[PDB]
């Protein structure tokens, strides 16, 4: 009673050392009621996951952490309103009205007082203010199953990090002044990789909210479309494993699982429609197989890499690339031709390793 009347924050710690755990939790729940910010309430419910009740507290932390991410992007919109228009303005002068600075501050003012449920967080905030990333987190927490809606969210997230392909404004060579940040082909990939990996880390192996084959097939197509018009000078910032390493290095997706998601991407997708795109995705696939050959350790793995299906895919991929390469060896330039000739010698070595790991069974 004395601490609950004078120091409520010492009160729950004393009750916890007295092993009165359910009373410490009932003081901490009343901190999370009475508290003035969202931060105090996350701390108080986090203690109710260091002490049924635990799962209710962990759900309140879960909603409150996405509710903080909604507040942060609303204050970013208030601080940087010139960017939150200029990233969108590129394709049309359709000035859809910039959000009411009173209503955003009323939203923030209420988001900082009380935790909301997942459907109120989705509807009146995340969907209202076009927060597709925070909408996708709410779909994961809520186990929402509309695979088409999730693919549209993933597309709109990829098409928020990739800047749209610059149209033919004129070479009026006297424009000396403007430090308008030329985002590198590195820097676009660096932002997009971070956007994919850091969302994947909370979700995987949820194939509904992290649809790996779609994220690959659209991400590689969007970096292909962005890079196609670039100079061969900028097509030297692009890592051939830009997405494929980070999905292993951070998201912990096995290189064996990635190899057949890339076989599915090449077999199912619109990659068969254009030579330059089929050369691109087949190059990523063979650099992903080059990663896998450096991770293969056991006799069991060597005994899988020598399977008929893997060997026959590698020989089909080499035959396909080698056919298209000699179709284009009359139109390509004398660096890019050599770039593809030095790739072919890797693919022929990769097929030789799938064959040596096969006949490592006659001894």
């Amino acid at each position: 009673e004395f601490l609950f009347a004078n120091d409520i924050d010492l009160c729950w710690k004393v009750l916890a050392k007295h092993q009165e755990l359910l009373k410490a939790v009932h003081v901490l729940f009343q901190i999370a009621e009475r508290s003035t910010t969202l931060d105090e309430k996350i701390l108080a419910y986090t203690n109710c996951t260091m002490i049924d009740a635990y799962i209710q507290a962990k759900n309140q932390i879960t909603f409150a952490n996405i509710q903080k991410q909604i507040v942060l992007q609303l204050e970013n919109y208030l601080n940087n309103p010139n960017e939150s228009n200029n990233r969108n303005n590129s394709s049309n002068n359709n000035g859809g009205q910039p959000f009411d600075i009173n209503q955003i501050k009323e939203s923030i003012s209420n988001l900082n007082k009380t935790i909301f449920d997942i459907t109120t967080l989705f509807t009146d905030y995340a969907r209202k203010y076009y927060l597709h990333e925070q909408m996708l987190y709410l779909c994961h927490i809520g186990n929402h199953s509309d695979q088409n809606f999730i693919q549209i969210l993933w597309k709109i997230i990829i098409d928020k990090e990739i800047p749209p392909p610059s149209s033919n404004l004129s070479l009026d060579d006297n424009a000396e002044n403007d430090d308008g940040l030329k985002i590198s082909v590195g820097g676009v990939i660096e932002s997009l990789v971070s956007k994919i990996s850091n969302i994947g880390y909370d979700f995987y192996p949820n194939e509904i909210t992290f649809p790996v084959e779609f994220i690959i097939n659209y991400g590689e197509r969007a970096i292909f479309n962005f890079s196609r018009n670039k100079s061969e000078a900028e097509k030297k910032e692009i890592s051939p494993n830009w997405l494929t390493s980070s999905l292993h290095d951070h998201v912990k997706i096995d290189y064996w699982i990635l190899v057949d998601y890339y076989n599915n991407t090449i077999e199912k997708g619109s990659w068969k429609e254009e030579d330059e795109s089929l050369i691109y995705i087949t190059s990523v696939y063979f650099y992903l197989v080059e990663s896998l050959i450096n991770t293969i350790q056991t006799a069991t793995e060597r005994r899988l890499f020598s399977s008929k299906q893997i060997l026959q895919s590698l020989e089909n991929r080499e035959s396909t690339f080698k056919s298209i390469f000699n179709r284009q060896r009359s139109s390509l330039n004398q660096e890019t031709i050599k770039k593809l000739e030095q790739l072919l010698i890797k693919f022929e070595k990769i097929i030789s390793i799938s064959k040596s790991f096969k006949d490592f069974r006659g001894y």
């Binding site: 899988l304 399977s307 008929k308 299906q309």
Partner: protein, 521 residues
């Protein structure tokens, strides 16, 4: 009142099921029961009977033709203007509801070339005319084909066409599929309101519409539901009946008509659609089995899961029936299509490191699991069916139609791959011999022992043509012989001793003509 205590119709169903199979007078029983069903229907209209007893009258009427032979098919082909069960089945208020009833009568009548070609004519003479006052709408995929073919850029959305058409266009018949020919009529009532459009189409055009329209939308409703609705169950009945009907027509119609059904399916890609169905259904069997754990609500879900499994197994059985029937006439493109759609393989390693749901070995393992798991719950006294093997017995039939034409295939496929596809076929025949004691634990011995006679007949054909100059057949015969170590020779010897026991008990004169032909294989 009689049906509410001791029903005389299901009595006749048990009479035709369980009474007369081994009777050297059988067709004379059918030629009497046919006159009972007719002289019953001459006194009670089949509109005035509850439709479950009408379905059972159709079950019985179908069994009367199949067990009566051409003795009843030739009576019906001469008295069908007078037969009330047939005349009810071709009535518009039956046809525009439950056409699986008439399609089952047309299925059962097929027994030889004579009755098969008669059904092929009558399917084109039965015209379905939507002259009941219920506006049934044109099937949406053909409504859009008619919208395309006629420049119908204005639409009213009601399935009507509020446009001043030329009668000189409508007085023509249209190919909504290749070798289909639906006709169109304008109802000119005399009011001057709706100039309504009738379609006049045959029961043969409807067989094409079930197989090339409705069954695709049924595949996507199956793709969204873990339990079937009443219409999903009814469309499944109708599709089983249509697949068996076309399968019988392809077995028993002479050269020109079995080639017409081939070219009809070929030209409209129908064999690829049926394989996309097969590949989905074989994956849904992996959900209806692996959702069983190993108050009324627990008995109703388990019963519905078993019923839905039996429906899927029957649809796949009728697909394998139709593929057996087509492979008797064109074995090469059916074999190559089962390989190209990835049901089959020339390498056991590629089966093992893919484990594809809907490879033939996966379907045998599923039928082996549903037939063995039933053995434990021996605490109740309900009339469950014995475990049968209709799927595996249809897989054997589909393999035997590739084996008989072996001496033709040698000029039509690579020999190295064709050895590999025959090694995997032989490996399946061998597995069904090694597992024989697990299968024969099920009381349906006759069916299993026939399936093994159909296996031994095909392996004998490979051995007796291996002894020639053919090197393909010698490699395959050596691989059969190298597989006859221990358990495969044991289970063969067990069957030859079970045959010695059964010819030692059933000295009762009533030896079925199956037993002494299982010995003869």
């Amino acid at each position: 009142k009689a049906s509410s205590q001791y029903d005389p119709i299901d009595y006749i169903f048990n009479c035709l099921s369980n009474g007369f199979n081994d009777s050297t007078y059988l067709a004379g029983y059918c030629d009497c029961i046919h006159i009972f069903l007719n002289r019953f229907s001459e006194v009670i209209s089949l509109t005035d009977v509850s439709e479950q007893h009408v379905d059972r009258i159709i079950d019985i009427y179908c069994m009367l033709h199949e067990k009566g032979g051409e003795v009843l098919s030739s009576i019906l082909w001469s008295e069908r203007s007078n037969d009330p069960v047939y005349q009810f089945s071709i009535s518009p208020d039956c046809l525009n509801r439950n056409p699986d009833r008439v399609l089952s009568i047309l299925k059962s009548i097929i027994i030889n070339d004579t009755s098969s070609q008669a059904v092929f004519n009558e399917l084109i003479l039965i015209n379905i005319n939507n002259q009941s006052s219920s506006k049934q709408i044109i099937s949406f995929n053909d409504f859009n084909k008619v919208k395309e073919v006629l420049d119908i850029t204005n639409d009213d959305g009601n399935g009507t066409i509020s446009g001043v058409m030329k009668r000189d266009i409508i007085s023509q018949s249209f190919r909504l599929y290749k070798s289909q020919f639906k006709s169109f009529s304008v109802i000119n009532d005399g009011s001057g309101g709706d100039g309504g459009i009738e379609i006049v189409f045959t029961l043969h055009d409807l067989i094409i519409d079930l197989v090339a329209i409705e069954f695709n939308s049924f595949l996507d409703s199956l793709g969204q539901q873990a339990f079937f609705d009443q219409r999903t169950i009814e469309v499944s009945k109708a599709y089983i009946v249509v697949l068996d009907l076309i399968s019988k027509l392809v077995n028993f119609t002479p050269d020109s008509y079995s080639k017409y059904f081939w070219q009809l399916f070929e030209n409209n890609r129908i064999l690829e659609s049926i394989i996309q169905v097969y590949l989905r259904l074989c994956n849904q069997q992996n959900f209806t089995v692996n959702s069983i754990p190993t108050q009324p609500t627990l008995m109703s879900s388990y019963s519905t899961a078993h019923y839905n499994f039996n429906i899927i197994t029957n649809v796949i059985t009728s697909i394998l029936s139709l593929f057996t029937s087509f492979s008797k006439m064109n074995p090469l493109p059916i074999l190559n299509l089962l390989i190209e759609k990835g049901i089959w393989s020339s390498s056991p390693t590629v089966l093992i490191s893919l484990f594809k749901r809907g490879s033939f070995n996966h379907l045998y393992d599923v039928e082996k699991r549903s037939s063995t798991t039933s053995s434990t719950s021996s605490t109740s006294s309900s009339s469950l069916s014995s475990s049968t093997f209709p799927l595996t017995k249809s897989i054997v039939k589909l393999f035997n139609t590739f084996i008989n034409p072996l001496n033709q295939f040698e000029k039509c496929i690579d020999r190295s791959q064709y050895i590999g596809y025959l090694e995997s076929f032989i490996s399946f025949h061998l597995q069904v011999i090694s597992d024989y004691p697990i299968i024969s634990g099920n009381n349906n011995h006759n069916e299993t022992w026939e399936m093994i006679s159909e296996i031994f007949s095909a392996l004998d054909f490979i051995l007796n043509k291996s002894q020639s100059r053919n090197s393909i057949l010698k490699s395959l015969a050596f691989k059969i012989i190298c597989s006859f170590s221990g358990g495969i020779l044991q289970c063969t010897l067990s069957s030859l001793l079970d045959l010695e026991v059964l010819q030692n008990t059933n000295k009762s004169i009533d030896r079925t003509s199956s037993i002494d032909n299982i010995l003869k294989s």
